[PDB]
Amino acid sequence: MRPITCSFDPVGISFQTESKQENFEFLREAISRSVPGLENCNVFDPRSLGVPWPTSFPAAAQSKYWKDAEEAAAELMDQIVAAKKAAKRRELLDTSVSAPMNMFPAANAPRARIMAKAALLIFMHDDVCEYDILWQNRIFKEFSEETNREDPVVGPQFLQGILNWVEHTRKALPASMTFRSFNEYIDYRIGDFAVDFCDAAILLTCEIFLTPADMEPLRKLHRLYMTHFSLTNDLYSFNKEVVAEQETGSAVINAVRVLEQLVDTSTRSAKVLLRAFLWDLELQIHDELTRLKGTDLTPSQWRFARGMVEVCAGNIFYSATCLRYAKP
Amino acid sequence: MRPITCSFDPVGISFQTESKQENFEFLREAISRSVPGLENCNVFDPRSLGVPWPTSFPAAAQSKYWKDAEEAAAELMDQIVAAAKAAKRRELLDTSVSAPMNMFPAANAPRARIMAKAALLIFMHDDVCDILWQNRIFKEFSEETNREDPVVGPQFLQGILNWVEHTTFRSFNEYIDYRIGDFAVDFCDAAILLTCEIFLTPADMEPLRKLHRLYMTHFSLTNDLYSFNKEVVAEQETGSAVINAVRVLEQLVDTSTRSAKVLLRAFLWDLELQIHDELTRLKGTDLTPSQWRFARGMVEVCAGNIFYSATCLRYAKP
């Protein structure tokens, strides 16, 4: 399991649910015994590692091939830098590995390398926005070839999911924007999801394939998963944004700020409200999983459903373990 | 017509004709009257603008939309230097416009635009010899190209990429076969197709291949003669290697440098005669209108290459 530098909780409340989550239990069982779908993961309870774990999810899953992912990201990094300042590289590679290993833990060694390379590309572009060509184009084309030869079915959507993200990040969103309802912000915040890549990443790491029509029954669960992911990211990232907001005059589009204004409460209470919102979202995920279990669902369809749960849990762990959010 | 920076001839001897050269004369025709295929170019005589013109080709053609190509190349450069001394960029912009406008003169305003951007990409790569951002620039260029010409354009972009991948002599014919090889053939053939607004399948190309090889030889050897002085000056300056037909011939014939330069110039004139002879032979053969348009385009690339080489400041002594 990848060493953890830090652990923190913005709200530091934590809770226990009144009902036993028979669903989500596969994560707990995976700590001690082999569970279907998690054969490529180390599954643990973050509380044993001293990480604050304010979630109904009993465990977190991490790909056991993170060391291969570190090498691949390091490899890609060297290609780019050929085509203080060392500080960003240490963080970029660390973040490029920690995110996919936790968010998409079912990755075997080769698919972990692809995921780590994909994360580095996404993260390098994200950092640039928050601030020869044929040669660079050749680097990505090689990355595309390695991906398409690993997974020919999902590979194109995987790479297309990356490119779709680049298109959306261009889109300016006015500083004059104000949100009247919290749902209204949710519909907006869900948009910064990069779902097409994330959905393809689940397909890739779980080594399954779903047509878009196969995804239609999972629409409700899919929206809950995007909501939990985005809102979780806002909660843990809020303090880091406030630091950046005072320094560079950067805006905060965080749900904390939205909640503070809409409900007219203190910042600390808004964070508590956001954490509580997430706890109910986790319950809604659990109910939807139960409802879906009643319906006739394909094994691959159910594996995708469970993968979304693994993204949410891994996102919480990643965010709690992330230094950029923790003590900025 | 694009302003001229310099004009030079490495050798200095002029061509004299014992033969009419009727198949070339469409180049004459185009100076005074409209010639089919040359509606998008200004056709002129380099000698009149004081440019040494040591060729049997009577005229050279340059696209009338070079100012648009000047614009497009400038835009692309700005995007590139935004994604992450100054003399190189100005030189790169110059050659990126001068070469394709002369080599591929039939280009209209949009097609001149594609060529200048394509030339800039190639030339910046040769000089060298956030990732997702740079990739997006090439992506828009590909879509911009395919959207002008959906049939020729995928080959035109594939020819660029094929060029990117591909990066003492005992026999001169052996040296020629090598230099033919270092020829960005895929791109150049596609650029002729694009600028001439015609398409030829590979089977359509079967008849013109002997001329195509003559054209490749004339292009390579012409570039070698003009480049030579820069290669030799570099060799004294930085001990850099000289791979040039001039040096090869000087070695094989064991002769002086001007004799080698004169020898190659005469060889080039004989290639132009062979080009002219093949044109007549093909005229008897059954050729499609654009099949014939491709043949004339290759001559236009050859003539334009001489003009470009004579007009290039780098090829001229610094």
Structure's resolution in angstroms: 2.6
The answer to the question of residue A20 being in a domain is: no
Distance CA B181, CA B27 (A): 29
Distance CA B187, CA B156 (A): 6
Judging contacts by C-beta atoms under 8 Å, the chain A residues touching residue B77 are none
The CATH number of the domain where B196 resides is what? Answer: 1.10.600.10
Distances (CA, A) of A312 to A222, A227, B112: 11, 10, 52
The answer to the question of residue A15 being in a domain is: no
Amino acid of residue A304: F
Distance CA A200, CA A217 (A): 17
**C-beta of residue B237 within 8 angstroms of C-beta of residue B183:** no
Search chain B and give the residue with CA nearest A137.
B135
To test the contact with chain A by mutation, choose from B134, B162, B163, B164 the residue with the greatest count of A C-beta atoms within 10 A, namely B134
Judging contacts by C-beta atoms under 8 Å, the chain B residues touching residue A137 are 134-135, 138
For chain B, first and last CA: distance in Å?
A: 24
Neighbours of A195 (CB within 10 A): 18
Would you state the structure tokens that stand for residue B125, as one six-digit string? 């790569």
Distance CA A107, CA A72 (A): 14
Phi, psi of A242 (to 5 degrees): -60, -40
Search chain A and give the residue with CA nearest B118.
A134
The answer to the question of residue A127 being in a domain is: yes
Of B83, B128, B133, the CB nearest to A135: B128
Distance CA A60, CA B57 (A): 76
**C-beta of residue B111 within 8 angstroms of C-beta of residue B159:** no
Would you state the structure tokens that stand for residue B150, as one six-digit string? 């959906």
The answer to the question of residue B293 being in a domain is: yes
- How far does CA A180 lie from the centroid of its chain? 27
Distances (CA, A) of B164 to A228, A235, B167: 45, 47, 6
Which runs of E-coded beta strand occur in A5-44? 41-44
Neighbours of B317 (CB within 10 A): 11
Placement of tokens 């002594």 in the chain: B317
DSSP letter at B2? Answer: -
**C-beta of residue B81 within 8 angstroms of C-beta of residue B67:** no
The answer to the question of residue B10 being in a domain is: no
The answer to the question of residue B2 being in a domain is: no
Phi, psi of A57 (to 5 degrees): -65, 120
- Count of structural domains, chain B: 1
Distances (CA, A) of A3 to A6, A67, B7: 9, 11, 67
The answer to the question of residue A14 being in a domain is: no
Would you state the structure tokens that stand for residue A297, as one six-digit string? 């669902």
Distance CA A115, CA A99 (A): 9
- Backbone angle region of A251, left / alpha / beta, with phi > 0 → left and psi within -120 to 50 → alpha: beta
3-state secondary structure of A60: strand
Distance CA B93, CA B86 (A): 11
Phi, psi of A62 (to 5 degrees): -130, 140
CB–CB contacts below 8 A, A to B: 54
Exposed / middle / buried, residue B188 (Cβ in 10 Å: 0-12, 13-18, 19+): buried
Buried-state track B290-306, b at ≥16 Cβ within 10 A, e below 16: bbbbbbbbbbbbbbbbb
Pairing of strands A60-63, B60-63: unpaired
Distance CA B135, CA B43 (A): 38
Q: Using beta carbons and an 8 Å cutoff, which residues of A are at the interface with B?
A: 80, 121-122, 124-125, 128, 132-140, 162-163, 166
Query: What residues form DSSP beta bridges with A60?
Result: A44
The answer to the question of residue B11 being in a domain is: no
For chain A, give percent helix, strand, coil, nearest 5: 65, 0, 30
**C-beta of residue A316 within 8 angstroms of C-beta of residue A55:** yes
Instruction: Give A81's contacts (C-beta < 8 A, 6+ positions apart).
Output: A89
- Test A140 with B132 for CB contact under 8 angstroms: yes
Pairing of strands A60-63, A41-44: antiparallel
Neighbours of B82 (CB within 10 A): 9
Which residue segment(s) compose the domain that A269 sits in? 25-321
Query: What residues form DSSP beta bridges with B60?
Result: B44
- How far does CA B231 lie from the centroid of its chain? 19
Count how many Cα atoms sit within 13 Å of the Cα of residue B156 in the half-sphere of its side chain.
30
